[PDB]
């Protein structure tokens, strides 16, 4: 029935001010809040009754309501800003209604190196004929990583589970790689690694059994 | 709100595919349908990612990767498409299609 | 300090039953509405219902009505859901979100717990089982090291991860689950300690699997 619109990605360089727009059929009529939600984190309000900022939020933070269109200004834009932000109203017949949110970006974080961390199958693990070696990459952007195993030198395809990267609070990207082996396996070669290849780069930490 | 380059180029292509292709998209392949939403570049990336078999996508796969500040990767096996329904390929562009016209409508 | 506390996800059947709860704290619980607002993952926010402050007026979406019943009781300052003929569909994280007013046409929210994950599905739950990352000095910086937990082959998320009951909270890295081709879960949560307080502190994590009910304090020691 009544659906709110926003376009679902903006970004602005640092500190140069940052414009998001909800839509809907007389969308003044009513009042608007602003909310922002980070990867993994429960939404925060920022606005509330078009423009009424709570305790708490920078005065950087701003919106208007006029006729069609809400419009939530963030000038001074930020780093830490960068999150997904949605419009919410309420509307008579429908309720609680909420836009589709959008993604803000500032522009142009720097290049930023993987942080490498590769354990070895538990001595429980391998007590439990079971053995999982784990490759865990932190502090990287932009969020684009191969990882890649080898055995002895060697690429191990089968048996590697392996995530898409992920935004850290602190706005570059985790991912984590694991690789299944029979107690075997890893009891029977010289050692095993895991390389992550970051733009061009690559770290590979090896490990091996006693 | 004037159109970002990069984007008006990936409206272009999509316009292109959904118009110009003859016979159906991918021949029956099947994917995940998306909504006007926040993850959405990648959503549709993540989405087209999958079928293999088709070359009249890997322009536009390649061009939605720009919009996508992670890394997606096919086969990525989730209970993710929970709100989702699987719909045709050529449908599914036309959608991403309007839905990207529609940012521009004043 | 405002909060709001839910509980109660979990594996369901389709078609299966489900209770929340939430628990206020911090402020007049009987002078507010509250709403529950779920969210898919990826997925943006749906509102599902609301409650009057004294009960006089229920509320519910479209998409839920007839199935899902809100519920408050003022005196334990707790809001319920009770949800029935579960939808696969209705697998989200399950927010608790207080209002601005009293009545509906004030109902929208400003404080929002920090939501519970219910989900929807035909597979089966299953319990993990922790493994201890033991301590390397290798890949961290002087003076420091690295000791850890893995969370392995469990469904369905979310998995809580602490150390030393709380009370260590910093070098802590949770990080992010991994979908298997098993179609399980797994996570690794790492934390970086002085290298010399080795053999002397104890170290332990707190796993927490509240769908399956389970917990397990794993000890990491030294190799």
């Known amino acids: 029935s009544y659906e709110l619109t926003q376009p679902p990605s903006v970004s602005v360089a640092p500190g140069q001010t940052a414009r998001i727009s909800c839509s809907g059929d007389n969308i003044g009529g009513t009042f608007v809040s602003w909310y922002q939600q980070k990867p993994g984190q429960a939404p925060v309000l920022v606005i509330y009754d078009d423009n009424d900022r709570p305790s708490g939020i920078p005065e950087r933070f701003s919106g208007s309501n006029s006729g069609n269109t809400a419009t939530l200004t963030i000038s001074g834009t930020q780093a830490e800003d960068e999150a997904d932000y949605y419009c919410g109203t309420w509307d008579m017949v429908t309720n609680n209604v909420f836009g589709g949110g959008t993604k803000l970006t500032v522009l142009g974080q720097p290049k930023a190196a993987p942080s490498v961390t590769l354990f070895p199958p538990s001595s429980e693990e391998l007590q439990a004929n079971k053995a999982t070696l784990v490759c865990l990459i932190s502090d990287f952007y932009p969020g684009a990583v191969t990882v890649a195993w080898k055995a002895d030198s060697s690429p191990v395809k089968a048996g590697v589970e392996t995530t898409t990267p992920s935004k850290q609070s602190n706005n570059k990207y985790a991912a984590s790689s694991y690789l299944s082996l029979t107690p075997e396996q890893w009891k029977s070669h010289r050692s095993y690694s895991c390389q992550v290849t970051h733009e061009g780069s690559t770290v590979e930490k090896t490990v091996a059994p006693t | 709100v004037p159109p970002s380059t990069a984007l008006r180029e990936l409206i272009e292509e999509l316009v292109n595919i959904t118009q110009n292709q003859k016979a159906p998209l991918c021949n029956g392949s099947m994917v995940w349908s998306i909504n006007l939403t926040a993850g959405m570049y990648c959503a549709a990336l993540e989405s087209l990612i999958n079928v293999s078999g088709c070359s009249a996508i890997e322009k536009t796969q390649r061009m939605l990767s720009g919009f996508c500040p992670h890394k997606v990767s096919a086969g990525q096996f989730s209970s993710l498409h929970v709100r989702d329904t699987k719909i045709e390929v050529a449908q599914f562009v036309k959608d991403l299609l309007l839905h990207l016209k529609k940012l521009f409508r004043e | 300090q405002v909060q709001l506390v839910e509980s109660g996800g979990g594996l369901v059947q389709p078609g299966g039953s489900l209770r929340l709860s939430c628990a206020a704290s911090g402020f007049t619980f009987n002078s507010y509405w509250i709403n529950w607002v779920r969210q898919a993952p990826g997925k943006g926010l749906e509102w599902v219902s609301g409650?009057?402050?004294?009960?006089?007026?229920?509320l519910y979406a479209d998409s839920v009505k007839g199935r899902f019943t809100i519920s408050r009781d003022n005196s334990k300052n707790t809001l319920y859901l009770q949800m029935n003929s579960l939808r696969a569909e209705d697998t989200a994280v399950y927010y608790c979100?207080?209002?601005?007013?009293?009545?509906?046409?004030?109902?929208?929210?400003?404080?929002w717990g920090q939501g519970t994950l219910v989900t929807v599905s035909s597979a089966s739950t299953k319990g993990p089982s922790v493994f201890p990352l033991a301590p390397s000095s290798k890949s961290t910086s002087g003076g420091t090291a690295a000791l850890g937990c893995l969370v392995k082959d469990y469904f369905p998320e979310p998995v809580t991860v602490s150390w030393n009951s709380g009370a260590l909270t910093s070098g802590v890295h949770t990080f992010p689950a991994v979908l298997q081709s098993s179609g399980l879960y797994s996570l690794s949560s790492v934390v970086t300690v002085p290298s010399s307080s080795l053999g002397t502190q104890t170290y332990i994590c707190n796993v927490n699997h509240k769908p399956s009910n389970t917990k397990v304090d794993k000890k990491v020691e030294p190799k």
């Open positions: 979100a207080r209002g601005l007013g009293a009545f509906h046409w004030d109902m929208q929210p400003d404080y």
């Open positions: 409650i009057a402050y004294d009960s006089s007026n229920t």
